[PDB]
Amino acid sequence: EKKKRTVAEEDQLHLDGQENKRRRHDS
Amino acid sequence: TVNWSVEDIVKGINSNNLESQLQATQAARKLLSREKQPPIDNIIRAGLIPKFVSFLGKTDCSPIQFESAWALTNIASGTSEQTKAVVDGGAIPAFISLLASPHAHISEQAVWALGNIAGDGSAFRDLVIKHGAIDPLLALLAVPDLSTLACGYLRNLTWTLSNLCRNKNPAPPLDAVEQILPTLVRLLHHNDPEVLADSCWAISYLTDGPNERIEMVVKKGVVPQLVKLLGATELPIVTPALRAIGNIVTGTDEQTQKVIDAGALAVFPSLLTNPKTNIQKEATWTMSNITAGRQDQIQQVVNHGLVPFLVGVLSKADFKTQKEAAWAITNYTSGGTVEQIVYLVHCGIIEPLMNLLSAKDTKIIQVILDAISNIFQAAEKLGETEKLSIMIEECGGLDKIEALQRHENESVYKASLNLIEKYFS
C-alpha cells in the first residue's frame, strides 16, 4: 500500500529544501 | 548611515524629530543587513520594535516606512523568539496595510516581512491569514500578464504565497487554499526559474496531506505542468516538482493515474539515474507508490521499461535509495500478476535482492524476505519453485537466508525458517 511522506530525523527540508525565512542583505 | 552603535540609534529614535528618527532607522537597518552576525537581540533588547512598527504608518514619510519595514523584516528572519517579538509589537496589521502602498518597493518589503512571519510555522501563518493578508496579496498579482511586474517583486510575492501554503498540524485553512490556488496555478506557468521553483514548493506542500487535499490541487489541472517541470534542467525546479508528483501518487488510484496519463513515467529513466542522490531517492520512493497501485498501473511501469532501472538501483545506489527500491519490488510482487512477477525475475531482480540481505538493517531484511515469499508463490503457481530455489542458491542467497535464522528479530526468524522449510528442505 501507499507510504505517505515520512519524517526522518532530519528530512523536512534536509538542506535541499526551500528557505522558510530570508534576511535582506547589502548593508 | 554606517556602523552606528545601538546607543546612538536609540538616541536618534527617541528624538522628537522625524528626520532624525529616519536617519537612526536607516542606521539600524544597515546593522541588521550586514553580512555577519546582525545584532538582532541587541536591537530587540533596546526596545526598538514598537517605534519601528509605529513608523510603518508614517504615510507622509515613505522613506521611514521603507527603512522600518526592512529593519523589521530582518528581525523577523531570525529565530521563532525574534519573529515573535515582531508579531508582539503589532506588525502584522501594519504590514498588511502597506500592501496597498503606491510605492512598489514599500509594498514589496511588506510582502517579504509577512513571508518571514508566516514562514515561522502554522500558528503565525494562520494569524497572518486571519488578519486578512490573502486578498491584498492576490490583488497585487491580478494583472493580465505577470511579465509586466518587476521580476524581484514577483519572486517575493511567490515565495510569500508558498509560506501561506506551507506546514502541517494543522494544514492551511481549506478556504485559504481554495482562494490562493488559481493565482498559484498562473505562477506555475510563469517563465521565471525562481518563480517556478517556489510555485512547485507551494504545490508540493498542498499535496502533502490527506487525499482530499491532493484532489483540490489535481482538479485545477496542474499535473501536466508538473510533469513538464519534472524535466527542467534546473535542479531547484526538479526537486520540488518531483516531491509534488511523489505526493500525488500517495493518493487514490485515480489521482495516481492522472500522473501516468500526463506522461510522468517517461521521465524516470533519467530520474532513476540522476547524479543527485536525493533525486534518485525521491524518484524511487515515487516508483514504490506507483507499484503499490493497480495491475494496469504496474503494467505501465513495465511498458515504460522501468523494471531494469529498479534492478539498477537495487544493484548500486545510496543505501536509502536501495531501501525504497526494495519497497518498490515488494509492492510490485504483492499486487502484480504472475506474468508481471515472472518478468521481474527475467530482468535480473534476484541477485541484487539477495545481496541486500547482508544489510545490518532489520526493516529492509523483512521487506526483502516478503518479496521472496511473494515470488515463490508465483513460481509454484507455475510449479517452478525449485528452479527459483536453484537461482537463489547459486548466487549465494541460500547462505544468507539460513544466516538470518540466527537473527535477533522475531519476524525475520520466522520468515527465514519458513522459506527454508518449504522451498529449500
Description:
The complex is a heterodimer of chains A (27) and B (425). Chain A is mostly loops and 27 residues long. Chain A contains no helices and no strands. The radius of gyration of chain A is 15 Å and the shape is rod-shaped. Chain B is elongated, with a radius of gyration of 28 Å. Helices cover 70% and strands 0% of the residues of chain B. Chain B starts with 5 loop residues before the first helix and ends with a helix. In chain B, helix 21 crosses helix 22 (319-335) and helix 23 (338-346) packs across helix 25 (362-381). Chain B is mainly α and 425 residues long. Classes of the chains: A little secondary structure (27), B mainly alpha (425). Chain A binds chain B through residues 1-5, 14, 16, 18-27, and chain B through 29-35, 38, 70, 73-74, 76-78, 83, 109, 112, 115-116, 119-120, 159, 162-163, 166, 197-198, 201, 208, 239-240, 246-247, 249-251, 276, 278, 285, 288-289, 292, 327, 331. Chain A: The modification Phosphoserine is found at residue 27. Chain A: It is found in: Nucleus, Nuclear pore complex; Nucleus membrane; Endoplasmic reticulum membrane. Chain A: It comes from Rattus norvegicus.
Portion of residues within helices of chain B: over 70%
Number of strands of chain B: 0
β-strand percent of chain B reads under 5%
Report the count of strand segments of chain A. 0
* Biggest sheet features of chain A: none
Greatest interface and its participating residue counts: A-B, 17 and 44 residues
What Rg of chain A, in angstroms, do the CA atoms define? 15 Å
- Shape verdict of chain B: elongated
Function (chain A): Essential component of the nuclear pore complex (NPC). The repeat-containing domain may be involved in anchoring components of the pore complex to the pore membrane. When overexpressed in cells induces the formation of cytoplasmic annulate lamellae (AL).
Family (chain A): Belongs to the POM121 family.
Biased composition (Basic and acidic residues) (chain A): 6-20
Region (Disordered) (chain A): 2-27
